[PDB]
């Protein structure tokens, strides 16, 4: 009963503006305090802003006063953040969370003790990119001697250059699961993304079966069946 | 910069102990309570500790917290392979009068033998090439730590621009994989003799190559 849900998260341009809620339930939310912590792919927790149990108090990193305003709506259960004149390194993960205690304790401006976030939701991704919407090119990773090693022989399909995330990839529509090495993407420097994905079979199976991995990329509408084989000359 | 300053990384065997430090000033931990954070792999943060040493509830009593004037410290006795995350201490700092976060602290828990990487190298494909784009693929499989250098080289001479790495990822076998991709034109591709790449894992090193005129 006790969580947090949010939402609003997405892709933005550089200076652009974004709106995210976090809709808290199985508690009185209208008498904690709240926070916004945000997390950057592979970084640590920064803590964002933080507004009391009725509005009159907020708090938030000197990174982002001017541009991010924190307020909510106790009538509607819900705390948002409204974001505006994102850049490159507001791009994370935006978890919203709660107070342990509904009272505070302070003694000034500068003094709170802190009581520590006991809630906190499954958060909620922004990610800010000057890169446009495009579909990935799709190229075989043909299978030889390279690529085989005792009667196993290894084969798969180069996803290239598509934004944004994310790509899913399967072999034989499905029927092919073993095996199957799907490499998590690379961030290049154009803002574009890249991965490969790579079955294992055996060698002797190669004449008498096609091996197809089917590319699906929702943002463009790209969905692409690309068939591996040996090359000739 | 963080103004507490937590270790970058932890590592202890099932079932031993270990610390976590958490140094700050009289602005933060000196004149506040500090509590934990425990984040495992792909999920958000859970409250550990709150109040310097309680817990809250479904939090077991391997857990615990300690302070000493400025300094903080999370101990975890008879560790686990669940134990394996992320923790972060956390307090409101007077000065700034902002709510802060360390750094954070890796716990891998030793719980696996080391294994050594598998490496597959594929070239171009005619397509691509066809297209004006070369793009070499190295993959990299089944290795353990997770942690990998990659260098790539052009008839021995090494080569840094068009290279992109990826880190390490958790296999579902528990081992990491990793790839890492070189992009040039189809006139250098075909300019030099051989590419290769060198994967290095715990100072032993793993090559292959890849030629222009094989097919």
């Known amino acids: 009963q006790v969580q947090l849900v949010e939402s609003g998260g997405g892709v933005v341009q550089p200076g652009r503006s974004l709106r995210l809620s976090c809709a808290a339930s199985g508690f009185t939310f209208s008498s904690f305090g709240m926070h916004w912590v945000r997390q950057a792919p592979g970084k640590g927790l920064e803590w964002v802003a933080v507004i009391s149990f009725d509005g009159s108090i907020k708090y938030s990193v000197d990174s982002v006063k001017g541009r991010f305003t924190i307020s909510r709506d106790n009538s509607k259960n819900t705390l948002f953040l409204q974001m505006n004149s994102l850049r490159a390194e507001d791009t994370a993960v935006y978890y919203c969370?709660?107070?342990?205690?509904?009272?505070?304790?302070?003694?000034?401006?500068?003094?709170?003790?802190?009581?520590?976030?006991?809630?906190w939701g499954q958060g909620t991704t922004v990610t800010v990119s000057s890169a446009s919407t495009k579909g990935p090119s799709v190229f075989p990773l043909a299978p030889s001697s390279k690529s085989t090693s005792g009667g196993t022989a290894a084969l798969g399909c180069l996803v290239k250059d598509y934004f944004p995330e994310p790509v899913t990839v399967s072999w034989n529509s499905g029927a092919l699961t073993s095996g199957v090495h799907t490499f998590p993407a690379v961030l290049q420097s154009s803002g574009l993304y890249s991965l490969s994905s790579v079955v294992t079979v055996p060698s002797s199976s190669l004449g008498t079966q096609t091996y197809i991995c089917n590319v699906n990329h929702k943002p463009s509408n790209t969905k692409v069946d690309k068939k591996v084989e040996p090359k000739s000359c | 910069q963080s103004v507490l300053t937590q270790p970058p990384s932890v590592s202890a065997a099932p079932g031993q102990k270990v610390t976590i430090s958490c140094s700050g000033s009289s602005s933060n931990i000196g004149n506040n309570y500090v509590s934990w954070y425990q984040q495992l792999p792909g999920t958000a943060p859970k409250l550990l500790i709150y109040?310097?040493?309680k817990r809250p509830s479904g939090i077991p009593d391997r857990f615990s917290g300690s302070k000493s004037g400025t300094s903080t410290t999370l101990g975890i006795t008879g560790l686990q392979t669940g134990d394996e995350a992320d923790y972060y201490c956390?307090?409101?700092?007077?000065?700034?009068?902002?709510?802060?976060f360390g750094g954070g602290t890796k716990l891998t828990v030793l719980g696996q033998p080391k294994a050594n990487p598998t490496v597959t190298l594929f070239p171009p494909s005619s397509e691509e090439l066809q297209a004006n784009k070369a793009t070499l693929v190295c993959l990299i499989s089944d290795f353990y730590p997770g942690a990998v250098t990659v260098a790539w080289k052009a008839d021995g001479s090494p080569v840094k621009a068009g290279v992109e790495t990826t880190k390490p990822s958790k296999q579902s076998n528990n081992k990491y994989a990793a790839s890492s991709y070189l992009s040039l034109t189809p006139e250098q591709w075909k300019s030099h003799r051989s590419y290769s790449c060198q994967v290095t894992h715990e100072g032993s090193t793993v090559e292959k190559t890849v030629a222009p005129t094989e097919c």
């Open positions: 956390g307090t409101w700092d007077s000065r700034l009068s902002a709510v802060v």
């Open positions: 109040d310097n040493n």
């Open positions: 969370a709660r107070d342990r205690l509904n009272y505070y304790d302070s003694s000034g401006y500068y003094h709170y003790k802190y009581y520590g976030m006991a809630v």
